[PDB]
Scaffold this active site. Structure first.
Site, PDB file in Angstrom:
ATOM      1  N   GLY A  14      11.789 -12.937 -51.312  1.00  0.00           N
ATOM      2  CA  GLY A  14      13.180 -12.695 -52.644  1.00  0.00           C
ATOM      3  C   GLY A  14      14.018 -13.287 -52.438  1.00  0.00           C
ATOM      4  N   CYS A  41       5.839 -13.378 -45.624  1.00  0.00           N
ATOM      5  CA  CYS A  41       5.626 -13.898 -45.876  1.00  0.00           C
ATOM      6  C   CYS A  41       4.879 -14.819 -44.577  1.00  0.00           C
ATOM      7  N   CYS A  46       1.652 -13.058 -44.967  1.00  0.00           N
ATOM      8  CA  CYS A  46       1.199 -13.733 -45.677  1.00  0.00           C
ATOM      9  C   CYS A  46       0.000 -14.493 -45.043  1.00  0.00           C
ATOM     10  N   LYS A  49      -2.262 -14.494 -41.527  1.00  0.00           N
ATOM     11  CA  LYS A  49      -2.855 -13.453 -41.481  1.00  0.00           C
ATOM     12  C   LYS A  49      -3.929 -14.632 -42.316  1.00  0.00           C
ATOM     13  N   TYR A 180      -5.355  -2.446 -48.476  1.00  0.00           N
ATOM     14  CA  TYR A 180      -5.884  -4.535 -48.543  1.00  0.00           C
ATOM     15  C   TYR A 180      -5.537  -4.580 -46.915  1.00  0.00           C
ATOM     16  N   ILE A 181      -4.330  -4.390 -46.361  1.00  0.00           N
ATOM     17  CA  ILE A 181      -3.951  -4.640 -45.045  1.00  0.00           C
ATOM     18  C   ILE A 181      -5.225  -3.941 -44.386  1.00  0.00           C
ATOM     19  N   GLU A 184      -8.542  -5.505 -44.398  1.00  0.00           N
ATOM     20  CA  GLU A 184      -8.069  -7.281 -43.958  1.00  0.00           C
ATOM     21  C   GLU A 184      -8.608  -6.964 -42.520  1.00  0.00           C
ATOM     22  N   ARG A 330      13.704 -15.159 -58.861  1.00  0.00           N
ATOM     23  CA  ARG A 330      14.078 -16.465 -59.891  1.00  0.00           C
ATOM     24  C   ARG A 330      14.434 -16.137 -60.966  1.00  0.00           C
ATOM     25  N   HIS A 450     -21.618 -25.790 -63.497  1.00  0.00           N
ATOM     26  CA  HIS A 450     -22.767 -25.506 -63.398  1.00  0.00           C
ATOM     27  C   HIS A 450     -22.613 -26.486 -62.460  1.00  0.00           C
ATOM     28  N   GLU A 455     -18.424 -19.816 -63.341  1.00  0.00           N
ATOM     29  CA  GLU A 455     -19.309 -19.491 -64.659  1.00  0.00           C
ATOM     30  C   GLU A 455     -19.892 -18.627 -64.861  1.00  0.00           C
TER      31      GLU A 455
HETATM   32  C1  LIG Z   1      -0.607  -7.411 -43.218  1.00  0.00           C
HETATM   33  C2  LIG Z   1       0.930  -8.447 -44.437  1.00  0.00           C
HETATM   34  C3  LIG Z   1      -0.526  -9.244 -45.542  1.00  0.00           C
HETATM   35  C4  LIG Z   1       0.459  -9.382 -45.942  1.00  0.00           C
HETATM   36  N1  LIG Z   1      -0.908  -9.978 -47.079  1.00  0.00           N
HETATM   37  C5  LIG Z   1      -0.413 -10.997 -48.289  1.00  0.00           C
HETATM   38  C6  LIG Z   1      -0.700 -11.840 -49.166  1.00  0.00           C
HETATM   39  O1  LIG Z   1      -1.753 -11.897 -48.443  1.00  0.00           O
HETATM   40  N2  LIG Z   1      -0.786 -12.140 -50.623  1.00  0.00           N
HETATM   41  C7  LIG Z   1       1.369 -11.484 -50.728  1.00  0.00           C
HETATM   42  O2  LIG Z   1       1.442 -12.131 -51.917  1.00  0.00           O
HETATM   43  N3  LIG Z   1       1.308 -10.511 -49.943  1.00  0.00           N
HETATM   44  C8  LIG Z   1       1.428 -10.063 -48.991  1.00  0.00           C
HETATM   45  N4  LIG Z   1       1.775  -9.339 -48.149  1.00  0.00           N
HETATM   46  C9  LIG Z   1       3.168  -8.733 -48.867  1.00  0.00           C
HETATM   47  C10 LIG Z   1       4.232  -9.857 -48.821  1.00  0.00           C
HETATM   48  O3  LIG Z   1       4.518 -10.008 -47.225  1.00  0.00           O
HETATM   49  C11 LIG Z   1       5.716  -9.093 -49.224  1.00  0.00           C
HETATM   50  O4  LIG Z   1       5.923  -8.160 -50.360  1.00  0.00           O
HETATM   51  C12 LIG Z   1       6.656  -9.852 -49.212  1.00  0.00           C
HETATM   52  O5  LIG Z   1       7.240 -10.056 -47.743  1.00  0.00           O
HETATM   53  C13 LIG Z   1       8.022  -8.365 -49.820  1.00  0.00           C
HETATM   54  O6  LIG Z   1       9.155 -10.470 -49.113  1.00  0.00           O
HETATM   55  P1  LIG Z   1      10.533  -9.248 -49.421  1.00  0.00           P
HETATM   56  O7  LIG Z   1      11.497 -10.573 -49.972  1.00  0.00           O
HETATM   57  O8  LIG Z   1      10.417  -8.305 -50.089  1.00  0.00           O
HETATM   58  O9  LIG Z   1      10.701  -9.266 -47.724  1.00  0.00           O
HETATM   59  P2  LIG Z   1      10.603  -9.781 -46.797  1.00  0.00           P
HETATM   60  O10 LIG Z   1       9.783 -10.467 -46.890  1.00  0.00           O
HETATM   61  O11 LIG Z   1      10.359  -8.896 -45.687  1.00  0.00           O
HETATM   62  O12 LIG Z   1      11.963 -10.227 -46.321  1.00  0.00           O
HETATM   63  C14 LIG Z   1      13.084  -9.523 -46.262  1.00  0.00           C
HETATM   64  C15 LIG Z   1      13.907  -9.792 -45.265  1.00  0.00           C
HETATM   65  O13 LIG Z   1      15.551  -9.130 -45.139  1.00  0.00           O
HETATM   66  C16 LIG Z   1      15.994  -9.585 -43.635  1.00  0.00           C
HETATM   67  N5  LIG Z   1      16.563  -8.064 -43.448  1.00  0.00           N
HETATM   68  C17 LIG Z   1      16.257  -6.630 -43.891  1.00  0.00           C
HETATM   69  N6  LIG Z   1      17.433  -5.843 -43.312  1.00  0.00           N
HETATM   70  C18 LIG Z   1      18.750  -6.618 -43.417  1.00  0.00           C
HETATM   71  C19 LIG Z   1      20.097  -6.972 -43.228  1.00  0.00           C
HETATM   72  N7  LIG Z   1      20.949  -4.943 -43.474  1.00  0.00           N
HETATM   73  N8  LIG Z   1      20.769  -7.978 -43.404  1.00  0.00           N
HETATM   74  C20 LIG Z   1      20.011  -9.029 -42.994  1.00  0.00           C
HETATM   75  N9  LIG Z   1      18.902  -8.988 -42.902  1.00  0.00           N
HETATM   76  C21 LIG Z   1      17.697  -8.882 -43.297  1.00  0.00           C
HETATM   77  C22 LIG Z   1      14.675  -9.644 -42.665  1.00  0.00           C
HETATM   78  O14 LIG Z   1      14.596  -9.873 -42.310  1.00  0.00           O
HETATM   79  C23 LIG Z   1      13.326 -10.045 -43.238  1.00  0.00           C
HETATM   80  O15 LIG Z   1      13.460 -11.348 -43.116  1.00  0.00           O
HETATM   81  C24 LIG Z   1       1.704  -9.589 -46.587  1.00  0.00           C
HETATM   82  C25 LIG Z   1       2.583  -7.961 -46.244  1.00  0.00           C
HETATM   83  C26 LIG Z   1       1.737  -8.074 -44.236  1.00  0.00           C
HETATM   84  C27 LIG Z   1       3.083  -7.291 -44.134  1.00  0.00           C
HETATM   85  C1  LIG Z   2     -28.858 -35.700 -59.147  1.00  0.00           C
HETATM   86  C2  LIG Z   2     -28.116 -35.245 -61.078  1.00  0.00           C
HETATM   87  C3  LIG Z   2     -27.375 -34.453 -59.921  1.00  0.00           C
HETATM   88  C4  LIG Z   2     -27.131 -33.704 -61.369  1.00  0.00           C
HETATM   89  N1  LIG Z   2     -25.259 -33.103 -61.004  1.00  0.00           N
HETATM   90  C5  LIG Z   2     -25.376 -32.015 -62.061  1.00  0.00           C
HETATM   91  C6  LIG Z   2     -24.326 -30.941 -61.901  1.00  0.00           C
HETATM   92  O1  LIG Z   2     -23.571 -30.497 -60.632  1.00  0.00           O
HETATM   93  N2  LIG Z   2     -23.721 -30.818 -62.926  1.00  0.00           N
HETATM   94  C7  LIG Z   2     -24.166 -30.977 -64.083  1.00  0.00           C
HETATM   95  O2  LIG Z   2     -23.457 -29.850 -64.935  1.00  0.00           O
HETATM   96  N3  LIG Z   2     -25.209 -31.824 -64.949  1.00  0.00           N
HETATM   97  C8  LIG Z   2     -25.305 -32.477 -63.271  1.00  0.00           C
HETATM   98  N4  LIG Z   2     -26.117 -33.405 -63.845  1.00  0.00           N
HETATM   99  C9  LIG Z   2     -27.089 -33.332 -65.174  1.00  0.00           C
HETATM  100  C10 LIG Z   2     -27.848 -33.174 -65.079  1.00  0.00           C
HETATM  101  O3  LIG Z   2     -28.436 -32.265 -64.674  1.00  0.00           O
HETATM  102  C11 LIG Z   2     -27.812 -32.882 -67.060  1.00  0.00           C
HETATM  103  O4  LIG Z   2     -26.760 -33.711 -67.699  1.00  0.00           O
HETATM  104  C12 LIG Z   2     -29.305 -31.966 -67.612  1.00  0.00           C
HETATM  105  O5  LIG Z   2     -30.172 -31.951 -66.976  1.00  0.00           O
HETATM  106  C13 LIG Z   2     -29.354 -32.794 -69.587  1.00  0.00           C
HETATM  107  O6  LIG Z   2     -31.122 -31.703 -69.857  1.00  0.00           O
HETATM  108  P1  LIG Z   2     -31.195 -32.084 -71.155  1.00  0.00           P
HETATM  109  O7  LIG Z   2     -31.591 -31.353 -70.763  1.00  0.00           O
HETATM  110  O8  LIG Z   2     -31.142 -32.671 -72.173  1.00  0.00           O
HETATM  111  O9  LIG Z   2     -32.705 -32.776 -69.989  1.00  0.00           O
HETATM  112  P2  LIG Z   2     -33.376 -32.816 -68.987  1.00  0.00           P
HETATM  113  O10 LIG Z   2     -33.037 -31.358 -67.994  1.00  0.00           O
HETATM  114  O11 LIG Z   2     -34.051 -34.190 -68.079  1.00  0.00           O
HETATM  115  O12 LIG Z   2     -34.908 -32.466 -69.807  1.00  0.00           O
HETATM  116  C14 LIG Z   2     -35.343 -33.079 -70.399  1.00  0.00           C
HETATM  117  C15 LIG Z   2     -36.843 -32.349 -70.360  1.00  0.00           C
HETATM  118  O13 LIG Z   2     -37.916 -32.934 -71.236  1.00  0.00           O
HETATM  119  C16 LIG Z   2     -38.907 -33.026 -70.547  1.00  0.00           C
HETATM  120  N5  LIG Z   2     -40.010 -34.096 -71.146  1.00  0.00           N
HETATM  121  C17 LIG Z   2     -39.304 -35.505 -71.763  1.00  0.00           C
HETATM  122  N6  LIG Z   2     -40.832 -36.031 -72.678  1.00  0.00           N
HETATM  123  C18 LIG Z   2     -41.338 -35.598 -72.987  1.00  0.00           C
HETATM  124  C19 LIG Z   2     -41.719 -35.603 -73.964  1.00  0.00           C
HETATM  125  N7  LIG Z   2     -42.164 -36.601 -74.738  1.00  0.00           N
HETATM  126  N8  LIG Z   2     -42.693 -34.287 -74.156  1.00  0.00           N
HETATM  127  C20 LIG Z   2     -42.070 -33.415 -72.954  1.00  0.00           C
HETATM  128  N9  LIG Z   2     -42.115 -33.105 -72.482  1.00  0.00           N
HETATM  129  C21 LIG Z   2     -40.579 -34.223 -72.240  1.00  0.00           C
HETATM  130  C22 LIG Z   2     -39.036 -33.165 -69.101  1.00  0.00           C
HETATM  131  O14 LIG Z   2     -39.903 -33.565 -68.554  1.00  0.00           O
HETATM  132  C23 LIG Z   2     -37.980 -32.589 -68.822  1.00  0.00           C
HETATM  133  O15 LIG Z   2     -38.560 -31.846 -68.148  1.00  0.00           O
HETATM  134  C24 LIG Z   2     -27.040 -33.771 -62.909  1.00  0.00           C
HETATM  135  C25 LIG Z   2     -27.967 -35.276 -62.671  1.00  0.00           C
HETATM  136  C26 LIG Z   2     -28.502 -35.687 -61.771  1.00  0.00           C
HETATM  137  C27 LIG Z   2     -30.060 -36.479 -62.189  1.00  0.00           C
HETATM  138  S1  LIG Z   3       5.392 -17.106 -46.905  1.00  0.00           S
HETATM  139  C1  LIG Z   3       6.603 -17.432 -47.339  1.00  0.00           C
HETATM  140  C2  LIG Z   3       6.812 -17.450 -49.612  1.00  0.00           C
HETATM  141  N1  LIG Z   3       5.726 -19.166 -49.673  1.00  0.00           N
HETATM  142  C3  LIG Z   3       5.947 -19.081 -50.744  1.00  0.00           C
HETATM  143  O1  LIG Z   3       5.553 -18.037 -50.960  1.00  0.00           O
HETATM  144  C4  LIG Z   3       5.040 -20.368 -51.619  1.00  0.00           C
HETATM  145  C5  LIG Z   3       6.358 -20.906 -52.815  1.00  0.00           C
HETATM  146  C6  LIG Z   3       5.874 -21.210 -53.468  1.00  0.00           C
HETATM  147  N2  LIG Z   3       5.811 -23.105 -53.423  1.00  0.00           N
HETATM  148  C7  LIG Z   3       6.812 -21.505 -54.728  1.00  0.00           C
HETATM  149  O2  LIG Z   3       6.400 -20.893 -55.637  1.00  0.00           O
HETATM  150  O3  LIG Z   3       7.331 -22.683 -54.953  1.00  0.00           O
HETATM  151  C8  LIG Z   3       8.684 -17.821 -49.487  1.00  0.00           C
HETATM  152  O4  LIG Z   3       9.058 -17.096 -48.750  1.00  0.00           O
HETATM  153  N3  LIG Z   3       8.674 -18.848 -50.683  1.00  0.00           N
HETATM  154  C9  LIG Z   3      10.168 -19.523 -50.827  1.00  0.00           C
HETATM  155  C10 LIG Z   3      10.346 -20.399 -51.838  1.00  0.00           C
HETATM  156  O5  LIG Z   3      10.822 -20.021 -52.397  1.00  0.00           O
HETATM  157  O6  LIG Z   3       9.624 -20.909 -52.309  1.00  0.00           O
END
Ligand SMILES: Cc1cc2nc3c(=O)[nH]c(=O)nc-3n(C[C@H](O)[C@H](O)[C@H](O)COP(=O)(O)OP(=O)(O)OC[C@H]3O[C@@H](n4cnc5c(N)ncnc54)[C@H](O)[C@@H]3O)c2cc1C
Ligand SMILES: Cc1cc2nc3c(=O)[nH]c(=O)nc-3n(C[C@H](O)[C@H](O)[C@H](O)COP(=O)(O)OP(=O)(O)OC[C@H]3O[C@@H](n4cnc5c(N)ncnc54)[C@H](O)[C@@H]3O)c2cc1C
Ligand SMILES: *SC[C@H](NC(=O)CC[C@H](N)C(=O)O)C(=O)NCC(=O)O
Ligand SMILES: *SC[C@H](NC(=O)CC[C@H](N)C(=O)O)C(=O)NCC(=O)O
Lengths: 461, 461
Positions: A14, A41, A46, A49, A180-181, A184, A330, A450, A455
């Site tokens: 912050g 953080c 963050c 972790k 959550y902590i 995790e 901000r 897909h 999805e």
């Molecule tokens: C284990 C763990 C996992 C977490 N994981 C996530 C996550 O994945 N995603 C997420 O969004 N949040 C996560 N959080 C929460 C996140 O870290 C906090 O919400 C965030 O750091 C809070 O920011 P802050 O600025 O309020 O405080 P802080 O980041 O703690 O900053 C406070 C700062 O002020 C300083 N300070 C304190 N008192 C004084 C003073 N009197 N004079 C001068 N300096 C001082 C401290 O030294 C410290 O550096 C996690 C927290 C922990 C502990």
């Molecule tokens: C290698 C590969 C990877 C792909 N990966 C993706 C992906 O990740 N994501 C995505 O969204 N799309 C993907 N696609 C595209 C997707 O598979 C097609 O867009 C989709 O299958 C088209 O559906 P359709 O119903 O038009 O035809 P089809 O699925 O081909 O169905 C046509 C059916 O009609 C039958 N048929 C044809 N002629 C006759 C007839 N005269 N009488 C009776 N039956 C008949 C055929 O046997 C067939 O079963 C991929 C395609 C391929 C080949």
């Molecule tokens: S782990 C420290 C924090 N980083 C972030 O969360 C990244 C912020 C994004 N890139 C953003 O919103 O710009 C934190 O302390 N960030 C400080 C900062 O000013 O970005």
């Protein structure tokens, strides 16, 4: 007293985001930081972790190697290898963030800040005084630990901070907490090979999430080998000859409480909560309002009860996420320096991803929150449950669960909840749609991609 | 002549989706299929391709195993193991789709359909005649192959169909073509261990995609070990004592053409195009319009030039994707059976994912299409290029490239293009936003999810 336009206390998510946006607008800003820039953080949150999560994800895929036609991979994970690489990455980030401050011409005052009894809001860092017409408190929070008075030997356990200093994989670990902590940490330790137990007060984890998620997540944890100890809490912890011994009380409703001993525990991790960092600020010198937990109280514009003093981030106790502290920081810079008085963060529809296995993505209202806000008769939900195509050829399985919560006649999408492979990168776009006020028809009118899991959300019936 | 309300020719994506939605609306429908239900999507397309892609993705992650702290995995991939499991999965799907038809009370007429010279549109399958007031042609397409006349020995190469029948991994393979199918096949064969070359007529693949993608994709293919043979084409193919020998002509602009021989090729795969399946329908008996490629011509409502005859899917030659045939088939059922005359598919903003490595996601207009439609002065693009956090600890690297194309003052998002890890599951939601008419501000106002790659799209500046 050195004057600035903007004084930011705290160099975390912050504080940095706000100081930087303010500087871009012309403000002469300074950031006070007593430790490492990047705050939670970057240093113990963050970033480290996420690296550990990617590592755990690697372990899971290794299990599917043979199913995919490869020779099996042995398995001996080496903790210090990844720990060293992880620490290095964090070092690179601290350097980058410092550079980002210098290039924006933001002064960095190193040290611990505290307010003074000076009339106009003034702070003192190491004997030197600083002031500004706008001062932002962004001091974040800390892990909460039990008191030795209530739980003897509580100090033998570590917090998430201590987790990031571990140099070896613990053989046996017990995590206490259901948020959550906790989820995790349990997921990472278990995937990496620690015999893991998760101790929760009730019967499910993440109880504040939609019920479909709390249930599914509890089941996936068990399916992955985590022992979920329900209706249990720690009574005492003691250091034995080899490890720790945890005495816990399990009290299932409708049964008698039973006391159990968990021996040879290498790691006890408390993941019970976060406490705000406000005790040493001398807030009381200016009469800044806080709740009984120590959180600073603020209005919708991040204003405290004192003019010229604001607060954002974890210190406020609401929506404790990095992106939230950033966006609120901000928006605040724009309000104060670009004179946009309507600039503030909307705390509704904030998306969240929990890095469990599989990951969880959520945005909006749970089914109950929607029911309470619109009434049962006006709430319709759509859901699906399926096995991702990736598992079509594997013996190991995970499921994908998705739920859409709609409100009113138009079926406005008010909530999306899901758990499954790929859900961590799937959420952002749907969050944009929900923030825009999409209806189920908007979703239904978008052509599906897909084959993907994403999805399913546009083809719900 | 047996009468029905709806006769569907073709049991693939379009035909099945339409017949099923029609049956739900009360129509007595019948589907004619000469082969396997599920058509191309199930049998030789989307499904088997996706399984092979997941396998290739497994090979890439195995390369990063040691970087992640594990012992190295040897590598000997066994093709027939996965092929057998893949075939089995396809078998399960055919059974499911057949069951889905029976439960909807849709008759399945097995065989090849052809129109008759009967006044009112009538078809004949194996001597028996069938008719209906609404007949849908959804016969799909086939792989295109070079003629022996122009390329001698062309018949020694296989198409994507033949790729799915391979029982062993080819040691040396050459893929001819620059479209997505060519790119996908090259990416899978190369990741699995075949010495792969991709032969293209120009200098980049996917030339009809935004230029940022065609360039990036060509570079990633090379970085992954695929030999991209530019400005080259096959002149002749001949069967030698061991494999095939491909004679190609490379003609780089500003240089003299050079003839090269590629010997010991185990697999030559033509991925040059798709031809519509219409030759044996006797379309000419009713005077149904087709273009010179054999595609059936249709208006915006899928109507052919003959009343009561429609066409959807690949046979029409536009937006050759499974979800497109499905959506057009369903919209058609609603127009005809629910009397919604405005029911039709909008062919704008159709999203696509190319399963390359990393995968590609695209929706909307490329920068050039937007420039031509709104004019340079009215087109603004935002882009980013970064290395996903997953590679922070690996020696192997891939990049993530994202581009947003905005139009007019409001900066309406008219196109999103990206390539990178996770992009395959990231697109669907942004596609919903773009279909709704989101502007850059809508994106900018959505709180980011950290740490993910998807958050870069809502923080572009
Ligand atoms: C284990 C763990 C996992 C977490 N994981 C996530 C996550 O994945 N995603 C997420 O969004 N949040 C996560 N959080 C929460 C996140 O870290 C906090 O919400 C965030 O750091 C809070 O920011 P802050 O600025 O309020 O405080 P802080 O980041 O703690 O900053 C406070 C700062 O002020 C300083 N300070 C304190 N008192 C004084 C003073 N009197 N004079 C001068 N300096 C001082 C401290 O030294 C410290 O550096 C996690 C927290 C922990 C502990
Ligand atoms: C290698 C590969 C990877 C792909 N990966 C993706 C992906 O990740 N994501 C995505 O969204 N799309 C993907 N696609 C595209 C997707 O598979 C097609 O867009 C989709 O299958 C088209 O559906 P359709 O119903 O038009 O035809 P089809 O699925 O081909 O169905 C046509 C059916 O009609 C039958 N048929 C044809 N002629 C006759 C007839 N005269 N009488 C009776 N039956 C008949 C055929 O046997 C067939 O079963 C991929 C395609 C391929 C080949
Ligand atoms: S782990 C420290 C924090 N980083 C972030 O969360 C990244 C912020 C994004 N890139 C953003 O919103 O710009 C934190 O302390 N960030 C400080 C900062 O000013 O970005
Ligand atoms: S691979 C065969 C095709 N399947 C799909 O694309 C799934 C469709 C979605 N689940 C949906 O839109 O409902 C295809 O042929 N689908 C046939 C169908 O009617 O779903």
């Amino acid at each position: 007293v050195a004057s600035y336009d903007y004084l930011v206390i705290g160099g975390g998510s912050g504080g940095l985001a706000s100081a930087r946006r303010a500087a871009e607008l012309g403000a002469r800003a300074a950031v006070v930081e007593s430790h490492k820039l990047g705050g939670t953080c970057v240093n113990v949150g963050c970033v480290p972790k996420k690296v550990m999560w990617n590592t755990a994800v690697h372990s899971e895929f290794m299990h599917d190697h043979a199913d995919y036609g490869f020779p099996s991979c042995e398995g001996k994970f080496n903790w210090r290898v990844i720990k060293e690489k992880r620490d290095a990455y964090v070092s690179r980030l601290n350097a980058i963030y410092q550079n980002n401050l210098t290039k924006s011409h933001i002064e960095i005052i190193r040290g611990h800040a505290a307010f003074t009894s000076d009339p106009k809001p003034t702070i003192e860092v190491s004997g030197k005084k600083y002031t500004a017409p706008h001062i932002l408190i962004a001091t974040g929070g800390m892990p909460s630990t039990p008191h030795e008075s209530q739980i003897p030997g509580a100090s033998l356990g570590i917090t998430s901070d201590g987790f990031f200093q571990l140099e070896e994989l613990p053989g046996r670990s017990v995590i206490v907490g259901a948020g959550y902590i906790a989820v995790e940490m349990a997921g990472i330790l278990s995937a990496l090979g620690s015999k893991t137990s998760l101790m929760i007060r009730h019967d499910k984890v993440l109880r504040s999430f939609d019920s479909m998620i709390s249930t599914n997540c509890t089941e996936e944890l068990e399916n992955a080998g985590v022992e979920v100890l329900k209706f249990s809490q720690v009574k005492e912890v003691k250091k034995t000859l080899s490890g720790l011994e945890v005495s816990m009380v399990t009290a299932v409703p409708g049964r008698l409480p039973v006391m159990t001993m968990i021996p040879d525990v290498d790691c006890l991790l408390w993941a019970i909560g976060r406490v705000p960092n406000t005790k040493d600020l001398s807030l009381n010198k200016l009469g800044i309002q806080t709740d009984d937990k120590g959180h600073i109280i603020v209005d919708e514009f991040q204003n405290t009860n004192v003019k010229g003093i604001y607060a954002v981030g974890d210190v406020c106790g609401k929506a404790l996420l990095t992106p939230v502290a950033i966006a609120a920081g901000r928006k605040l810079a724009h309000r104060l320096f670009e004179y946009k008085e309507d600039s503030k963060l909307d705390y509704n529809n904030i998306p969240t991803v929990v890095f469990s296995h599989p990951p969880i993505g959520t945005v909006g209202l749970t089914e109950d929150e929607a029911i309470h806000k619109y009434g049962i008769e006006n709430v319709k939900t759509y859901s699906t449950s399926f096995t991702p195509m990736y598992h079509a050829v594997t013996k190991r399985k995970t499921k994908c669960v998705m739920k859409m919560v709609c409100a009113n006649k138009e079926e406005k999408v008010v909530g999306i909840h899901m758990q499954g492979l790929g859900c961590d990168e799937m959420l952002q776009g749907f969050a944009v749609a929900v923030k825009m006020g999409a209806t189920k028809a908007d979703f239904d009118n978008t052509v599906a991609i897909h084959p993907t899991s994403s999805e399913e959300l546009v083809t719900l019936r």
